[PDB]
From a paper:
[name] is a genetically detoxified mutant of [name] (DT) that is widely used as a carrier protein in conjugate vaccines. [name] is the G52E mutant of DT, which renders it catalytically inactive and thus nontoxic, without the lysine adducts and heterogeneity that result from formaldehyde treatment. Wild-type DT has been described in two oligomeric forms: a monomer and a domain-swapped dimer. The hinge connects the large module comprising the N-terminal (catalytic and transmembrane) domains to the C-terminal (receptor-binding) domain.
Here, [name] was expressed as a soluble, intracellular protein in an Escherichia coli strain engineered to have an oxidative cytoplasm. The purified product, called EcoCRM, remained monomeric throughout crystallization. The structure of monomeric EcoCRM is reported at 2.0 Å resolution with the domain-swapping hinge loop (residues 379–387) in an extended, exposed conformation, similar to monomeric wild-type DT. Three internal zones are missing due to disorder. The first zone is residues 30–33, a surface loop near the active site, and the second is residues 39–49, which form the active-site loop that is only fully ordered in wild-type structures that include a substrate analog. The G52E mutation site is well ordered in the present structure. The third disordered zone comprises residues 187–200. Based on comparing the pH across known structures (including during protein preparation), it is likely that maintaining a high pH and avoiding phosphate were important in maintaining the monomeric state observed in the present report. The dimer conformation gains two positive-φ residues, Gly383 and Lys385, and is more compact; the Cα distance between Tyr380 and Pro388 decreases from 16.0 to 9.8 Å. In [name], the side chain of Lys385 in the hinge loop is more solvent-exposed in the monomeric structure (SASA of 91.6 Å2) than in the dimer (SASA of 2.4 Å2).
Numbering used by the authors: 1 to 29, 34 to 38, 50 to 186, 201 to 535
């Protein structure tokens, strides 16, 4: 009955029920459908995650957050599961028409409304989160009044700075990114005017050389720069952890120079996509052993300045770019974004690192099925299923490029709206495309890193279009392929891959 699917401990009627909604750029200049449902949440800071430009999700401008209020009485109906078939079954609804259309009917409101004008559904927001998500009917949502909470397009704020500084209120790392940006330019100029740095630059081959020669030179560049008095703070931190050594630092800058071509360099979104899948970012960001070591505006600016100049030096040696301009422009802008992402994770409670089944370990990552049942993909019914996978990493921030998922035409499709990754409770949706008729690749809409203290739940959601059973000879994929960082070996690109094998059953 109702009781198997409604959580009565979280259900109630409120007058002037209010929640938060993240708005896309341009909106701030009521509520109207552009998603077959209007989503809101009790958490103004997580709302900020619905707000980035759908066309440039990693790097593009964030819009804002509004508070939306229904006048009169609203029933909040908390659900114990998010499976549409189960809900329709046990609430005794039509098993055919969409759940959210039915939720908007006179009859549903009378049956479940408890005297309210409308019903909103409530679900848990994500693994690792204590937030609530509300699901609203579009037509009903037209009654909402709307008040501005924050506009991230506010003049004077440069990147996604306004969004991340707002989100940092949740918390703690609370840096002024305007100060960092100003200080970064200042530090670059100081390094460029420094006699020893000028001397070191003139020692550059300044032409294509071996990766070994490049690294040797860049290591010396790193050491010379750390002796500048304006990098004294970064010098002190650098000596406290082997992650921050010149050799590791040099290795980041080489890898950057190797992957940035001119098409990439001239686009911030592409630059951010490329940088976000590289290993070894903890060496530059000062992150190791479960803590942010580069934790002031001074140290951050000093490391970004130095990495900028080191990328500039690396490009002639191992890169394919004619200009050095990338190093000062899109490189800095993109890396600032990555710092903000990782800080945001470290400002949140660590999702449990405890694998519930024996983990598979590879390349510093560990992955496991949440439960046996998660590893089973059932067949021979129409409808949805959800499957949880825990992802940790041992030490520095390691990226998750995305996930490779099986598909079978009309028997197993990825539900692109419910599939997501939650990093310390930050819920990040996915963009998914077919590699072919058998495999879909899903990439996070914000950069994902895991590391010590930053752990994730990957939630894969499938939809079945028909009631016929998947046949043994239809199974291309034995596994879900989680994709980690990309390494450039010879000149070829290899992704870290961690596979979890599943079983098809009736």
């Amino acid at each position: 009955g109702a009781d198997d699917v409604v959580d009565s401990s979280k259900s109630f009627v409120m007058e002037n029920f209010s929640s938060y909604h993240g708005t896309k750029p341009g909106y701030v200049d009521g509520i109207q459908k552009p998603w077959k449902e209007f989503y809101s949440t009790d958490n103004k800071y997580d709302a900020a995650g619905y707000s980035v430009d759908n066309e440039n999700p990693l790097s593009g401008k964030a819009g804002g957050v509004v508070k939306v209020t229904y006048p009169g009485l609203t029933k909040v109906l908390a659900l114990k599961v998010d499976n549409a078939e189960t809900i329709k079954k046990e609430l005794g609804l039509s098993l055919t028409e969409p759940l959210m259309e039915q939720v908007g009917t006179e009859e549903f409101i009378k049956r479940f409304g408890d005297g309210a004008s409308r019903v909103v559904l409530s679900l848990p927001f994500a693994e690792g989160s204590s937030s609530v998500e509300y699901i609203n009917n579009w037509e009903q949502a037209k009654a909402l009044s709307v008040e501005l909470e924050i506009n991230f397009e506010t003049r004077g704020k440069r990147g996604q700075d306004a969004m991340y500084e707002y989100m940092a209120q949740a918390c703690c790392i609370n840096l002024d990114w305007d100060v960092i940006r100003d200080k970064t330019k200042t530090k670059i100029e100081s390094l460029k005017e420094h006699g020893p740095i000028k001397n070191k630059m003139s020692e550059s081959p300044n032409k294509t050389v071996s990766e070994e020669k490049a690294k040797q030179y860049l290591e010396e560049f790193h050491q010379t720069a750390l002796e500048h008095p304006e990098l004294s703070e970064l010098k002190t931190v650098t000596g406290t952890n082997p992650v921050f050594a010149g050799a590791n630092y040099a290795a980041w800058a080489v890898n950057v120079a190797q992957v940035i071509d001119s098409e990439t360099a001239d686009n911030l979104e592409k630059t951010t996509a490329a940088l976000s899948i590289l290993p070894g970012i903890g060496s530059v960001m000062g992150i190791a052993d479960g803590a942010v070591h580069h934790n002031t505006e001074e140290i951050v600016a000093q490391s970004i300045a130095l990495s900028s100049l080191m990328v500039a030096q690396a490009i002639p040696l191992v890169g394919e770019l004619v200009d050095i301009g990338f190093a000062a422009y899109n490189f800095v802008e993109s890396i600032i974004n990555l710092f903000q992402v990782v800080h945001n994770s470290y400002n949140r409670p660590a999702y449990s690192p405890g694998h519930k089944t024996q983990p598979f370990l590879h390349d510093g990552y560990a992955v496991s099925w949440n439960t046996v049942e998660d590893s089973i993909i059932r067949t021979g019914f129409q409808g949805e299923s959800g499957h949880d996978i825990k992802i940790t990493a041992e030490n520095t921030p390691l990226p998750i490029a995305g996930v490779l998922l099986p598909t079978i035409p009309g028997k197993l499709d990825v539900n692109k709206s419910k599939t997501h990754i939650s990093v310390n409770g930050r819920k990040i949706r996915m963009r998914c495309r077919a590699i072919d008729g058998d495999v879909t690749f899903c990439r996070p809409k914000s950069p994902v890193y895991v590391g010590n203290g930053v752990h994730a739940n990957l939630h894969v959601a499938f939809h079945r279009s028909s009631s016929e059973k998947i046949h043994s000879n239809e199974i291309s994929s034995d596994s879900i392929g989680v994709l980690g960082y990309q390494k450039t070996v010879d000149h070829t690109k290899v992704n870290s891959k961690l596979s979890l094998f599943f079983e098809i059953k009736s």
